[PDB]
């Protein structure tokens, strides 16, 4: 046969799905969650051989090892070991679309393992093998004998090896297909890899055993009482003497327990499940579970004889919580959630799709430290440990079926086909059977980007029928079809409608109130964080807080999917689509994370942290009103730090304990404050600090902040007069001005400040000229390509208007001597092919103190696309170690992405002023700056700026950060105005109008001086 | 107004005056206005205005200049938004064209007098032999703001000597969501903190 080319065959001899088992033979060990002697890991060194097709595999491999096999660590993705290349494709299938067929050239991974089995496991009960994840399909043999087959790369495949093993040494032979009919359901936007990429284990169960169990928690109206119901099923020798005992513990305390013989209630004319039993435990004043306080109990399920013999024990953590939608709101324990969520793929820059505890933990800590309380499993069931971690650390989870068929045309081609119903159903049903007892899972999802087919309707219903405790959501086909209990669009904007045909993406506020609509709305994806992005993020948070039914969303996405490459000198470097000779590919579309692949945050992370804060603040006079957005906890680990500074100089500060009830408010009156007299702006900054460490944070962690401008004292103080007047010297080619050890030179042919000397040292490498463009961001580029231009993208509009190639024509240049200064006046026009795009008029006023005041007025043609920025630039000769500024910071911040930044006096190393996004672009800006210090220079005004060793030109023409080369000197970009970065999506223009430079006329002013 | 500075310089082809004034109240600096006046051989007077507004003061109703012209002319001609009165938050219906009206049509006789008759988005204004150019909003009538704010019924207003000219770089919206609470939208409040405008006065 060819089972891997038949959607009708998804497994052969596979065991039923069930929640996590360990088959403990001692209840206290079960209780403690200690390891089980009956649950073995088979991870470690295996033998591996690559073939280009299954037909190339030699029959001997089954009976014995291949001389040429290599020894490799399992779990792993063979691509990671260099056997073949990982593929980075977005929507288009990595294979020819011709279901259910696959290429006859189908990379085949032959894995093997000689392992030992204790006689004891074989003297009784059952011994099975468990593959937590094999991509994409595989055959299994034990001791040369064929055991079975399995599909679905993201759920466990279990086989009974009882009859194949023998005492001692045994050998597994695993033939893994990279491609199978299952692939047609695995079209998620990620690296296309293969192999035994999750844990392999061996489990011993007794013949008479616990075959499944479901745990449910129902509450009274005020949640002061609950009933824990556990349905238990057994397999094997059914006898009257059998019983099940379920006990619930809170720590070492048993809070409840029940025992009952088997035989469930009568359910129909043929009777009931004589192999099932439902135990019901009453629990008074249960400690409730939530992402805010992950209160857990432990339930131990004992299978035993009535006379006391324990047969085996299974067990799980239990979170008492109720999830329901009522009156159009998603409620948790009776309260309406505000999902601070993130989509997270399982990705490691070295291991690829293999997950490990340390990584998971690291993601979880980072998520929590950044004010996220929820995660969506985009777009498949995760490694089992993930669930355990979200249960214990506390994060609401969206568990998603491994079904994505985006590459089809139309998108529901398969999901609307009954012949794919069987393959789909397995993906949904086995997920629920495995993960239904985890409190962290609060919503089931049907998969992703597969259109809307009747198969979805059927499976939606199956779930609602088997697990009434969790809503079911599904974005496909328009985000609000009959297969979703929640409206869960991807990239719908806050106020702007995008009325695509058939599946329009309405503004989220508008969506909620369409005629007859009542569901809650939670974006399954929003705020596309690709490269320099997350602009407009606060606009989402504001709507969510204001509209009850706008209950949040999940940012796309947590981590960049970059892979490590090594250079000629073996130095690692971040690779993306196409870096492995993979084609076609979607280049850098695989990197959309809030953090880099090594877990290092991108600057956008901080903007998410702040908008997702759990405390809101208002300032009234000297009173601060703190409002808690926690639903269930009191601010028992929080204090409030406040501080007032005058233009960066600290004046007063204090701490106040925070004591606010969930959804409550606390007023805080500040002490009489400083009344300065001295010019400057007074700013108040408050921070919420966690004095004690937690499971997910260190003492002193800051969970929230906010700033306000208090009184401002405008400087009315006139500067002292100068014992000097600058001298002007002229030539046909220049105007030269001198004042002391300082000189300025203006080129009369170009019209620009071409050189400056401090002492006798030249200060510039390139002249100071206006600049109206930027090395385009991923959002500026969208999907535009060399071969496939997207004319509507910003970058294309600017290229076509000639912005990047415009030449400044001098219209005027004059020099005038004043009473106590020299004034140079210039005007330039930027044109392209006959069109005047921009006009820049300026004045440079150098006076007896050595300062140069630059005044600029620019006009922009109304019919030209709004420019990326309006500013000046130049390459300074100097390379200083540090950058000191008075403005927003300390991190990179842009017009539509600066709420998190705080205004203060910041001081960083040069290098921190550059952001190493993998795909190079304009980066490192800091907005709202009033003074900038670098080497000998100081600049003052009201501007945004950037400074680094790389020219906009260089950034623009380089594709990968590791190819960047520092230039001589420092490139400085000082803008009066800069366009928003966008981010609502990364493939259509997304800069909100209010962040577009469309004024026509712009004015700015700077003073350049020295220190 | 407190003068902080007043200089004059001669340029090659022009004369340049520079001024700085602070506006204070009970020791607080509310606004600071920095100007330049460039008079050239063509007789045009170029005015440049840079204004600072303390952050903690309430956002001002407007940011412009004004004067009482000696002259009283029959018509008003401009190239801007019109023909009728219009304000920042109430200017969609107005069209950009060349309008010409009797001076009286430039005053709106609301029963309860107030600021009225503004036209925004004006690039050119003509009155008598005068001409102003730039990008501004304006009102022109025989009543000072002072008289209007002091008068409760339009029937008690009286034409002052000359013509009052109010030329604004920026003007606050008027609101109207309701009339018993602040209703001017944030995007219509003059809260930028620093304001720039420029105008050319000349004779026509
Ligand atoms: Mg198949
Ligand atoms: Mg025995
Ligand atoms: Mg997709
Ligand atoms: Mg007992
Ligand atoms: Na809400
Ligand atoms: Na992507
Ligand atoms: Na506290
Ligand atoms: Na680039
Ligand atoms: Na009045």
Closest ligand, as measured to the CA of A118: 2
Edge-to-edge, what's the strand order for the sheet holding A649-657?
A649-657, A639-646, A680-690, A701-713
Domain that holds residue B168: 1-204
Q: How far apart are CA A756 and CA A407, in angstroms?
A: 59
Token digits for A251? 């720590």
- Structure tokens of A524? 């399954």
User: Is B3 within 8 Å of B17 (Cβ atoms)?
Assistant: no
The first and second tokens of residue B43, run together, are: 């007789």
Ligand nearest to the CA of A123: 2
SS3 A661: coil
Among all chains, which residue has been given the structure tokens 């969303």?
Answer: A553
Domain limit, last residue, from A150, A185, A206: A206
From the list A345, A374, A373, A371, the residue with the least C-alpha distance to A360 is A345
Contact B29 A711 (CB under 8 A): no
Are A317 and A439 in contact by the 8 Å Cβ rule? The answer is: yes
- Do both A343 and A303 map to the same domain? no
> Which residues neighbour A344 within 8 Å (Cβ) at sequence distance 6 or greater?
A363, A375, A376, A377, A378, A557, A558, A559
Is the bond preceding A890 in cis, omega lying within 30 degrees of 0?
yes
A484 plus A577 within the same structural domain: yes
Name the burial class of residue A459, with classes exposed (0-12), middle (13-18) and buried (19+) by CB atoms within 10 angstroms of its CB.
buried
Ligand 9 center–CA B195 separation, angstroms: 28
Give the residue among A629, A596, A589 at the shortest CA–CA distance from A611.
A629
How far CA A144 is from CA of A1, A126, A170, in Å, comes to 18, 20, 10
- Return the CATH number at A267: 2.60.40.10
- Is position B180 annotated in a ligand binding site? yes
By the CB < 8 Å criterion, does A823 face chain B?
yes
Across the interface, whether the CB atoms of B12 and A718 are under 8 A apart is answered no
Give the angle subtended at the CA of A436 by the CAs of A432 and A441, to the nearest 5°: 100
Q: Which residues of A touch B50 (CB under 8 A)?
A: 1005
Phi-psi region of B197 (alpha: psi -120 to 50; beta: other; left: phi over 0): beta
Nearest-CA distance A766 → chain B (Å): 30
Cβ of B95: how many Cβ atoms within 10 Å?
14
Residue A642 and residue A652 in one domain: yes
Of the partner residues B12, B29, B55, the one whose CB lies closest to the CB of residue A814 = B12
Rounded to an integer, what distance in angstroms lies between the CA atom of residue A269 and that of residue A740?
107
- The conformational region for residue B107 under phi > 0 = left, psi -120 to 50 = alpha, else beta, is beta
State how far the Cα of B4 lies from the Cα of B20, in Å rounded to an integer.
5
User: What's the distance, CA B203 to chain centroid?
Assistant: 19
Q: Do A681 and B55 touch (CB under 8 A)?
A: yes
- Report the residue of chain A nearest B135, measured CA to CA: A1001
Q: Is the dihedral of CA A358, A360, A363, A367 positive or negative?
A: negative
Q: Quick check: B185 contacting A, CB < 8 Å?
A: no
Q: Is B11–A823 a contact, with Cβ atoms under 8 angstroms apart?
A: yes
DSSP code string of B123-148: EEEEETTEEEEEEEEEEEESS-HHHH
Q: What is the largest CA-CA distance in chain A?
A: 112
Residues 6+ apart with CB under 8 A from A370: A594, A605, A608, A609, A612
Q: Which of residues 402-421 of A touch B (CB under 8 A)?
A: none
- Give the distance (Å) from ligand 1 centre to CA of residue A100: 8
**Can you state the percent helix, strand and coil of chain B, rounding each to 5?**
10, 55, 40
A655 and chain B in contact, CB less than 8 A: no
Inter-residue contact B186 to B30 (CB < 8 Å): no
| Cβ(A671)–Cβ(A643) below 8 Å | no
Please tell me which residue of chain B has the smallest CA distance to A1004: B196
| A338 and A279 within one domain | no
Does A224 share its domain with A366? no
Instruction: For residue A70, give both structure tokens.
Output: 């290599």
CA atoms of B73 and B140, how far apart (whole Å): 11
SS3 percent helix, strand, coil of chain A, rounded to 5, is 15, 40, 45
Q: Which of A534, A646, A604 lies closest to A930 in space, CA to CA?
A: A646
Flag whether residue B55 sits within 8 Å of chain A, measured between CB atoms: yes
Q: Are strands A374-376 and A339-343 parallel, antiparallel or unpaired?
A: parallel
Q: What does the alpha-carbon distance between residue A316 and residue A193 come to, in Å, rounded to a whole number?
A: 32
Q: What DSSP assignment string belongs to A343-367? A: E----BTTTBT---HHHHHHHHHHH
Tokens of A957: 């023409």
Residue window 29-48, chain B: list those with CB within 8 Å of chain A: 29, 31-32
Half-sphere exposure of B194 (CA within 13 A, CB side): 13
Pair (A684, A578) in one structural domain: no
Does A393 lie in the same domain as A305? no
d(CA A983, CA A993): 13
Contact A712 B54 (CB under 8 A): yes
User: Strand, coil or helix: what is A169?
Assistant: strand
Angstrom distance (rounded) from CA A966 to CA A636: 49
Q: Work out whether the CA dihedral B157, B158, B160, B162 comes out positive or negative.
A: positive
As a whole number of angstroms, the distance between CA A653 and CA A671 comes to 9
B189: left (phi over 0), alpha (psi -120 to 50) or beta: beta
Nearest 5°: CA angle at A81, between A77 and A87?
60
Q: Are residues A744 and A857 in the same domain?
A: yes
Among A716, A903, A1004, most B C-beta atoms within 10 A, so best to mutate, is A716
Residue/partner pairs of A221-224 with CB below 8 Å, 24 or more apart: A223/A286, A223/A288, A223/A322, A223/A333, A223/A334, A224/A284, A224/A285
- Domain end marker among A171, A206, A241: A206
Instruction: Report the DSSP beta bridge partners of residue A343.
Output: A376
What number of other Cβ atoms are within 10 A of residue A845's Cβ?
19
Strand-pair category, A970-978 with B2-10: unpaired
In 3-state terms, what secondary structure has residue A396?
strand
CA atoms within 13 A of residue B20's CA, in its CB half-sphere? 10
Structure tokens belonging to residue A391: 């249960």
Q: How many domains does chain A have?
A: 5
Q: Does A819 touch chain B (CB under 8 A)?
A: yes
d(CA B64, CA B136): 9
Name the nearest CA neighbour of A413 among A97, A111, A661: A97
Please answer whether residues A96 and A362 qualify as being in contact, where contact means their C-beta atoms are separated by less than 8 angstroms: no
Distance A449 CA to ligand 3 centre (A): 6
Of A681, A713, A818, the CB nearest to B9: A818
**What letters, b where the CB count within 10 A reaches 16 and e where it falls short, cover A897-911?**
bbbbbbbbbbebebe
Resolution (A): 2.0
Identify the closest residue of chain B to A818 by CA–CA distance.
Answer: B9
CB A236 within 8 A of CB A206: yes
Angle CA(A776)–CA(A782)–CA(A786) in degrees, nearest 5?
80
> Which residues touch A36 (CB under 8 Å, ≥6 apart)?
A22, A23, A24, A25, A29, A30
Considering only CA atoms, which of A113, A119, A258, A135 is closest in space to residue A185?
A: A135
CA distance B171 to chain A (A): 16
Tokens 């680990």, located at residue = A637
What is the distance in angstroms between the Cα of A711 and the nearest Cα belonging to chain B? 5
For A481, half-sphere exposure in the C-beta direction (CA atoms, 13 angstrom radius) is: 23
| Residue whose structure tokens are 């703190």 | A626
Q: Which residues of A224-251 are buried (b: 16+ CB within 10 A; e: fewer)?
A: eebebbbbbbbbbeeeeebbbbbbbbee
**Backbone region of residue B95 per phi and psi (left: phi > 0; alpha: psi in -120 to 50; beta: other values):** beta
CA A537/CA A539 separation, integer angstroms: 5
Burial A314-323 (b: 16+ CB within 10 A, else e): bbbbbbbbbb
What does A14-30 look like in DSSP terms, one character per residue? Answer: PPPP-S----BSSHHHH
What lies within 8 Å, CB to CB, of A485 at 6+ separation is A325, A471, A472, A473, A519
Q: Are A461 and A219 in contact (CB under 8 A)?
A: no
Distance A783 CA to ligand 8 centre (A): 14
Contact A563, A191 (CB under 8 A): yes
Nearest CA in chain B to A715: B29
A345 and A294, same domain (yes or no): no
The pair of three-digit structure tokens given for residue A107, joined into one six-digit string: 């990379």
Collect all residues with Cβ–Cβ distance below 8 Å to A572 and sequence separation of at least 6. Answer: A564, A565, A566
Q: Which residues of A touch B24 (CB under 8 A)?
A: 716
A766, containing H or E segment: strand A764-771
Angle between helices A421-435 and A454-466 (to 10 degrees): 30
| End-to-end CA, chain B | 31
Residues A698 and A723 in one domain: no
- Determine contact: B2 vs chain A, CB below 8 A: yes
A522: closest CA among A559, A545, A477, A490?
A490
Taking contacts as CB-CB distances below 8 angstroms, the residues of chain A near B22 are: 714, 716
A308 and A345 in a single domain? The answer is: no
Whether the CB of B22 is below 8 Å from some CB of chain A: the reply is yes
Question: CB distance B29–A716 less than 8 Å?
Answer: yes
Q: What's the CA-to-centroid distance between B139 and ligand 9, angstroms? A: 16
- Judged by a CB distance cut-off of 8 A, whether residue B9 touches chain A is yes
Cβ–Cβ under 8 Å, residues A666 and A686: no
Q: Which of A321, A347, A368 is the last residue of a domain?
A: A321
* Burial of B44 from C-beta contacts in 10 A (0-12 / 13-18 / 19+): middle
Q: Residue A441: in which H helix or E strand, if any?
A: strand A441-445
Q: Which two tokens stand for residue A194?
A: 């293969």
Residue B196 with chain A: CB contacts under 8 Å: 1003
Q: Which residue has the tokens 């082809």?
A: B13
**Residue where the block lists tokens 């009473």:** A819
Rounded to a whole number of angstroms, the distance between the first and last alpha carbons of chain A is: 81
- The CATH number that applies at residue A923 is 2.70.98.10
Beta strands in A630-717 (DSSP E): 639-646, 649-657, 665-669, 680-690, 701-713
In this structure, the number of other CB atoms found within 10 A of the CB of residue A549 comes to 22
Burial class (CB in 10 A: 0-12, 13-18, 19+), A377: buried
Identify whether the C-beta of residue A742 lies closer than 8 Å to the C-beta of residue A757.
yes
User: Distance between CA atoms of A510 and A505, rounded to whole angstroms?
Assistant: 10
Q: Do residues A110 and A64 both lie within one domain?
A: yes
What is the Cα–Cα distance from A868 to A979, expressed in whole angstroms?
A: 5
Q: What's the rounded Cα separation, in Å, for the pair B157 and B103? A: 16
DSSP state of B195: E
Which residues of A are known to be catalytic? 449, 525
How many helices (H) does chain A have, and how many strands (E)? 12, 58
- For chains A and B, CB pairs below 8 A equal 39
The answer to whether the CB of A442 falls within 8 A of the CB of A335 is: no
Is the Cβ–Cβ distance between A937 and A1010 less than 8 Å? yes
| Whether A714 and B196 lie within 8 Å, measured CB to CB | no
């Amino acid at each position: 046969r060819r089972d891997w080319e038949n959607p009708g065959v998804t497994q052969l001899n596979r065991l039923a799905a069930h929640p996590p088992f360990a088959s403990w033979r001692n209840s206290e060990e079960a209780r403690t969650d200690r390891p089980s002697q009956q649950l073995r890991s088979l991870n470690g060194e295996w033998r591996f051989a690559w073939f280009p097709a299954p037909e190339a595999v030699p029959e001997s491999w089954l009976e014995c090892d291949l001389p040429e096999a290599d020894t490799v660590v399992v779990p792993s993705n063979w691509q990671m070991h260099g056997y073949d290349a990982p593929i980075y494709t977005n929507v288009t299938y990595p294979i020819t679309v011709n279901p259910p067929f696959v290429p006859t050239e189908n990379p085949t991974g032959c894995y093997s393992l000689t392992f030992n089995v204790d006689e004891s496991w074989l003297q009784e009960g059952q011994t099975r093998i468990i593959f937590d994840g094999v991509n994409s399909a595989f055959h299994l043999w034990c001791n040369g004998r064929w055991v079975g087959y399995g599909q679905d790369s993201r759920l466990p495949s279990e086989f009974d090896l009882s009859a194949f093993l023998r005492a001692g040494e045994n050998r597994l032979a695993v033939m893994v297909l990279r491609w199978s009919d299952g692939s047609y359901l695995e079209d998620q936007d990620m690296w296309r890899m293969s192999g035994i990429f999750r844990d392999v284990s061996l489990l011993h169960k007794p013949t008479t055993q616990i075959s499944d169990f479901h745990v449910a928690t129902r509450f009274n109206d005020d949640f002061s009482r609950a009933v824990l119901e556990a349905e238990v099923q057994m397999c094997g020798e059914l006898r009257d003497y059998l019983r099940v005992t379920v006990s619930l513990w809170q720590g070492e305390t048993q809070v409840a327990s029940g025992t009952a013989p088997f035989g469930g209630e009568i359910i129909d004319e043929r009777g009931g499940y004589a192999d099932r039993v439902t135990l019901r435990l009453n629990v008074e004043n249960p400690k409730l579970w939530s992402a805010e306080i992950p209160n857990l109990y432990r339930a131990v399920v004992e299978l035993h004889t009535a006379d006391g013999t324990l047969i085996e024990a299974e067990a799980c953590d239990v979170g008492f919580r109720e999830v329901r939608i009522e009156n159009g709101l998603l409620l948790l324990n009776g309260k309406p959630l505000l999902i601070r969520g993130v989509n997270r793929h399982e990705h490691h820059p070295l291991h690829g799709q293999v997950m490990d505890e340390q990584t998971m933990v690291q993601d979880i800590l980072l998520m929590k430290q950044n004010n996220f309380n929820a995660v969506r499993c985009s777009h498949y069931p995760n490694h089992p440990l993930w669930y355990t971690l979200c249960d214990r650390y506390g994060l609401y989870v969206v568990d998603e079926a491994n079904i994505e068929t985006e590459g089809m045309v139309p998108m529901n081609r398969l999901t609307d086909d009954p012949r794919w119903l069987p393959a789909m159903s397995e993906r949904v049903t086995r997920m629920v059977q495995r993960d239904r007892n985890h409190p962290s899972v609060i919503i089931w999802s049907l998969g992703n980007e597969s259109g809307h087919g009747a198969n979805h309707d059927a499976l939606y219903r199956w779930i609602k029928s088997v697990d009434p405790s969790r809503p079911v959501q599904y974005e496909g086909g328009g985000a609000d079809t009959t297969a979703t209990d929640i409206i869960c669009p991807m990239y719908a904007r806050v106020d702007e409608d995008q009325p695509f045909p058939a599946v329009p993406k309405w503004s989220i506020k508008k969506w909620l109130s369409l005629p007859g609509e009542t569901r809650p709305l939670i974006l399954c994806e929003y705020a596309h964080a690709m490269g320099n992005s997350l602009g407009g993020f606060a606009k989402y948070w504001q709507a969510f807080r204001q509209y009850p039914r706008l209950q949040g969303g999940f940012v796309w996405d947590w981590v960049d999917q970059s892979l490590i490459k090594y250079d000629e000198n073996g130095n690692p470097w971040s690779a993306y689509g196409g870096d492995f000779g993979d084609t076609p590919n979607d280049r850098q579309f695989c990197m959309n994370g809030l953090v880099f692949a090594d877990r290092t945050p991108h600057p956008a992370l901080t903007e998410a942290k702040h908008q997702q804060q759990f405390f809101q603040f208002r300032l009234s006079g000297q009173t601060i009103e703190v409002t808690s957005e926690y639903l269930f906890r009191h601010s028992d680990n929080e204090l409030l730090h406040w501080m007032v500074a005058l233009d960066g100089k600290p004046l007063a500060s204090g701490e106040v304990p925070l004591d606010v009830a969930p959804q409550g408010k606390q007023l805080i009156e500040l002490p009489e404050l400083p009344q300065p007299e001295s010019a400057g702006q007074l700013w108040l900054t408050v921070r919420v600090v966690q004095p004690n460490a937690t499971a997910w944070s260190e003492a002193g962690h800051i969970s929230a902040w906010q700033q306000w401008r208090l009184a401002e004292n405008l400087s009315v103080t006139l500067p002292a007069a100068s014992h000097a007047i600058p001298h002007l010297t002229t030539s046909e080619m220049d105007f030269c001005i001198e004042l002391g050890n300082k000189r300025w030179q203006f080129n009369r042919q170009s019209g620009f400040l071409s050189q400056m000397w401090i002492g006798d040292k030249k200060q510039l490498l390139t002249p100071l000229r206006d600049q109206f463009t930027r090395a385009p961001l991923d959002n500026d580029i969208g999907v535009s390509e060399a071969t496939r231009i997207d004319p509507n993208a910003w970058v294309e509009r600017w290229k076509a208007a000639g912005h990047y190639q415009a030449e400044a024509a001098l219209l005027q240049c004059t020099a005038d001597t004043l009473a106590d200064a020299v004034l140079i006046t210039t005007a330039h026009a930027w044109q392209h092919q006959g069109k005047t795009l921009f006009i820049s008029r300026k004045t440079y006023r150098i006076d007896g103190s050595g300062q140069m005041a630059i005044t600029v007025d620019v006009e922009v043609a109304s019919d030209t696309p709004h420019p990326a920025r309006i500013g000046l630039n130049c390459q300074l000769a100097q390379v200083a170690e540090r950058v000191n500024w008075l403005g927003l910071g300390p991190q990179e911040n842009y017009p539509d992405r600066l709420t998190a930044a705080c205004f203060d006096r910041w001081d960083l190393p040069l290098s921190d002023m550059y952001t190493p996004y993998v795909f190079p672009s304009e980066n490192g800006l800091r907005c709202g700056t009033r003074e900038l210090n670098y080497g000998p220079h100081q600049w003052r005004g009201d501007f945004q700026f950037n400074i680094s060793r790389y020219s906009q030109q260089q950034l623009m023409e380089t594709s990968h950060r590791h190819l960047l080369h520092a230039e001589e000197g420092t490139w400085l970009n000082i803008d009066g105005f800069h366009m928003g970065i966008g981010g609502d999506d990364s493939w259509s223009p997304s800069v909100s109008a209010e962040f577009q430079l469309s004024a026509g006329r712009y004015h700015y002013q700077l003073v350049w001086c020295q220190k």
